[PDB]
Ligand binder design. Structure first.
Ligand SMILES: CCC(=O)c1c(-c2ccccc2)c2cc(Cl)ccc2c(=O)n1Cc1ccc(C(=O)O)cc1
Length: 342
């Protein structure tokens, strides 16, 4: 007569509260598998994320702890909601796994990126990304690693960001996706809030091109793809780089870059009606202001929200919503356990 039961999901066991039924794996990330499930108590579908021994190293431990704390403070429609948290283990010494129960949506932004979207849906998704990032920024959280695999959407075009970013070493096969990180993250130069604007620009550009904008095996290839398309940065940008980094950037092959009309031609946009022709030119204008290498010249979150492509959605309830170190593995274990048990 225990509150829990176990089922096999791949080569992992999910041990969950009996209220959660008919689990089905929907995806996997760096922290492992997420299942969809029916919650018999709430009478709705939910997502269940299993953290296996998150205290096992600093990198897992710090993300798990941060995720728990921030999910409990933050309440915004464009940030994914935490519904419940549990461990099946009964004592700290027995403690192994943490299960996060989240609201469930319909699809990954990666799936939406593959679609041809009208301007109304495209702009509304972007508005919602900006709103969620704005709310984060107002709580002092700068995400720094926004990427489409970690944003989810519903059939009615509502959007939620799944994680809180952060930007080290783990011995797993999992490969971290870096295509969406800002120049200042890539070149390790320090950053402000509009570091996240670059990532939105990369996603928007990909929604249009249906190809990843700046792929690369690692930061070297990636920087190559940046300057080859946007062109070599100006001198005032060069001055803000650490000395070893500056020499490297100043010595790469030079490129003029492409115009934004060439980068995102009208053939990529809905452009049959006068409405869509105007929207395409507006979409291209915002792209030209987000995909800007020098953060001092890159558009801010607030100005982006005011941009004509975006501002048709503006709602102060949504935009100006009220805002909310290191240890050993044993220390992290108790921190996380304490958080879990409230
Ligand atoms: C590819 C999975 C995916 O996009 C996803 C993930 C996800 C994101 C990255 C890694 C792991 C999980 C997710 C994770 C948490 Cl914590 C909460 C909600 C979701 C979610 O709503 N979806 C959409 C979704 C929901 C059901 C199905 C389905 O029924 O097939 C497909 C997509």
């Amino acid at each position: 007569d225990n509150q829990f039961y176990s089922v096999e999901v791949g080569d992992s066991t999910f041990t969950v509260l009996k209220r959660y039924q008919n689990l089905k794996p929907i995806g996997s990330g760096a922290q492992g598998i997420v299942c969809a499930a029916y919650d018999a108590v709430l009478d709705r579908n939910v997502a269940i994320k299993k953290l296996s021994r998150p205290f096992q190293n600093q990198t897992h431990a710090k993300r798990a702890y941060r995720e728990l704390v921030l999910m409990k403070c933050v309440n915004h429609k464009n940030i994914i909601s935490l519904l419940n948290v549990f461990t099946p283990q009964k004592t700290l010494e027995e403690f192994q796994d943490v299960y996060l129960v989240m609201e469930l949506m319909d699809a990954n932004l990666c799936q939406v990126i593959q679609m041809e979207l009208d301007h109304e849906r495209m702009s509304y998704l972007l508005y919602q990304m900006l709103c969620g990032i704005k709310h984060l920024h107002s709580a002092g959280i700068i995400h720094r690693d926004l990427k489409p695999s970690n944003i989810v959407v519903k059939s009615d075009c509502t959007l939620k960001i799944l994680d809180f970013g952060l930007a080290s070493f783990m011995m797993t096969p999992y490969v971290v996706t870096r295509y969406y990180r800002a120049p200042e993250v890539i070149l390790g130069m320090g950053y402000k809030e509009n570091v996240d604007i670059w990532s939105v620009g990369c996603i928007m550009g990909e929604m249009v091109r249906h190809k990843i904008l700046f792929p690369g095996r690692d930061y070297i290839d990636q920087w190559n793809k940046v300057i080859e398309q946007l062109g070599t940065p100006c001198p005032e940008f060069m001055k803000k780089l650490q000395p070893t980094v500056r020499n490297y950037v100043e010595n790469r092959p030079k490129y003029a870059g492409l115009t934004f009309p060439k980068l995102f031609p009208d053939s990529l946009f809905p452009a049959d009606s006068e409405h869509n022709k105007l929207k395409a030119s507006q979409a291209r204008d915002l792209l030209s202001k987000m995909l800007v290498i020098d953060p001092a010249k890159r558009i801010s979150v607030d100005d982006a929200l005011q941009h004509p492509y975006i501002n048709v959605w503006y709602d102060p309830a949504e935009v100006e919503a009220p805002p909310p170190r290191e240890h050993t593995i044993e220390e992290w274990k108790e921190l996380i356990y304490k958080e879990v048990m409230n």
